Amino acid sequence: WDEHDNRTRLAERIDTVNRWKETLDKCLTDLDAEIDSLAQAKESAEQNLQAKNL
Amino acid sequence: GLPPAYTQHLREMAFWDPAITAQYLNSGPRWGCMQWRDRQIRGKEFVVTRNQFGAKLPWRSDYVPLLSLPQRPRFTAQDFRQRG
Amino acid sequence: WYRSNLVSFQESNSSRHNSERLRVDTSRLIQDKYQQIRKTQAHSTQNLG
Amino acid sequence: LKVAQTRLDERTRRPNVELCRDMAQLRLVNEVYEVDETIQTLQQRLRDS
Amino acid sequence: RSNVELCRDQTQYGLIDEVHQLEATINTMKQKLAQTQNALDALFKHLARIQADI
Amino acid sequence: CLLQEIRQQLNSDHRDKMETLEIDRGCLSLNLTSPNISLKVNPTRIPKDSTTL
Amino acid sequence: CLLQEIRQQLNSDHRDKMETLEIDRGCLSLNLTSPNISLKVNPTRIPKDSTTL
Amino acid sequence: RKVGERLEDMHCWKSELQREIDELSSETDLMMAQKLRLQRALDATSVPYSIATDNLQCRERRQHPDLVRDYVEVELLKETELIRNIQELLKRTIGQAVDQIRLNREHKESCEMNWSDKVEVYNIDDTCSRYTNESTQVQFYPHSSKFEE
Numbered sequence A: 001w002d003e004h005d006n007r008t009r010l011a012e013r014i015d016t017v018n019r020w021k022e023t024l025d026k027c028l029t030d031l032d033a034e035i036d037s038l039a040q041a042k043e044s045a046e047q048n049l050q051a052k053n054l
Numbered sequence B: 001g002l003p004p005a006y007t008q009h010l011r012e013m014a015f016w017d018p019a020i021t022a023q024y025l026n027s028g029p030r031w032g033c034m035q036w037r038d039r040q041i042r043g044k045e046f047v048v049t050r051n052q053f054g055a056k057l058p059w060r061s062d063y064v065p066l067l068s069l070p071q072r073p074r075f076t077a078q079d080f081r082q083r084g
Numbered sequence C: 001w002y003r004s005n006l007v008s009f010q011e012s013n014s015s016r017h018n019s020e021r022l023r024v025d026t027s028r029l030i031q032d033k034y035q036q037i038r039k040t041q042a043h044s045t046q047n048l049g
Numbered sequence D: 001l002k003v004a005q006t007r008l009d010e011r012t013r014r015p016n017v018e019l020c021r022d023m024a025q026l027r028l029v030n031e032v033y034e035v036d037e038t039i040q041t042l043q044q045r046l047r048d049s
Numbered sequence E: 001r002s003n004v005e006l007c008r009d010q011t012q013y014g015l016i017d018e019v020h021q022l023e024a025t026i027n028t029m030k031q032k033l034a035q036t037q038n039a040l041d042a043l044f045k046h047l048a049r050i051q052a053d054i
Numbered sequence F, G: 001c002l003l004q005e006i007r008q009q010l011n012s013d014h015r016d017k018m019e020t021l022e023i024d025r026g027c028l029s030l031n032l033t034s035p036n037i038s039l040k041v042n043p044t045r046i047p048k049d050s051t052t053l
Numbered sequence H: 001r002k003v004g005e006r007l008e009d010m011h012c013w014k015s016e017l018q019r020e021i022d023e024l025s026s027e028t029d030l031m032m033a034q035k036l037r038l039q040r041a042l043d044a045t046s047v048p049y050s051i052a053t054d055n056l057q058c059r060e061r062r063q064h065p066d067l068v069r070d071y072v073e074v075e076l077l078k079e080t081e082l083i084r085n086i087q088e089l090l091k092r093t094i095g096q097a098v099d100q101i102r103l104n105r106e107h108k109e110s111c112e113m114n115w116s117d118k119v120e121v122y123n124i125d126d127t128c129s130r131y132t133n134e135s136t137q138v139q140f141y142p143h144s145s146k147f148e149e
Helices: A002-050 B004-009 C002-048 D002-013 D023-048 E010-053 F002-029 G002-029 H002-045 H047-060 H071-129
Strands: none
Touching (some): A002 B004, A002 E010, A002 F002, C002 D023, C002 G002, D002 D023, H002 H047, H002 H071, H047 H071
């Protein structure tokens, strides 16, 4: 039964680690979306700047 | 309808990683370690893929030609024993 | 004599179990890989069109 | 893999401007690498067998 | 484990605990074996005496 | 640029935790009557960094 | 012996239905802008065996 | 006397294989550190490529009667090529590194298991050697052939 107790501890540790994993995964996906949006914003601003000489 | 990593790479400014693709969708590869090989010993079992998960199994494509074993989980339609 | 025969039967049973579980996992792997490869090819061809 | 390679290679001939970063070169490297590691894993399972 | 993800948890402590308990147990079994052998030897001496008397 | 370094650090952390995952799940799967098991030198040793929870 | 013929006919049925499975899966798979799409002869043809549900 | 000779002979090999496993572990830690260093360098690599791309775009942003091609663009192309080549070089090198890691750990495990075995056999030999004729742990059995296997 000491062996059984150790097994249970290991299982709960696994559960905690995996939930933290999925949290960071969703964070990374949101980060990617935001990066793309900021990119497009920057190029748009640049083309607006280019038009300022006529 | 396209992954944001793919969309980012199909843009002028260079921001993508120095790797093949995104990685959170991926797994053990991209420099994983701790490869567990089983030495064949007569006397002991030969358990493979010690990555035993516990996870969502579609019990759908399950035709083993001869699984006459203490196995074939869920339904079995089996007997218990005859003792002796 | 009894010791040796017991050991022999144990070896046999262990081999049986290992063989069967290996069968199961290989069976799984075949079809999953096949289907994903099919989908990946089809998407590519369509977008090229 | 052979067919995917053959599809990938030719687009070098595209002379001056139609030379493009495209769906094809984006998807093909990923597909190729996936199939390579797939075959290697198959070989692993085979030596196990 | 990893570079900085090499952490000491309660599982480590527990494993050391079962280790120590197990060596204690091994000592206990050797001790008991000793007296078992002593009793068997005494029985043998008794039987030899009885046979000579017979 | 700031978001770039944020991204790379997040990737590093993710790979760290995943490695931990495969390691400890292999540990769970291992049980009695195992092929590579053996008595070992000073498993009572201490790690050299000893990070806390 | 009886169980033997039962098992063989059930296996035959199994292969039949799985074939139908991949056939219908491909039928869902294709769509517009395909390379293999082409005008065929007599789409209006009727099958010869003429079985039903 | 013969038993004592055999015991000391065993003790020797126990000692050196102890120490051998020790330095193997140390060297494994060293390659851990160097692999991590290479990973950090690869992490640092990325930024100048983006800088060069942005600079090329900015230089492209110019007016009609003034735009030329000189050292600037050519050397920027050289920069980019060097960057990319360094990238795949680092990838391949670190791959071979991790493979070496795998081999070293396997050899560690094998030598460790053999060391373990000599440990237990030595312990049992020492424990058994304490026997004397008058003491306990003294039993009659029948003989056998695995006695002589």
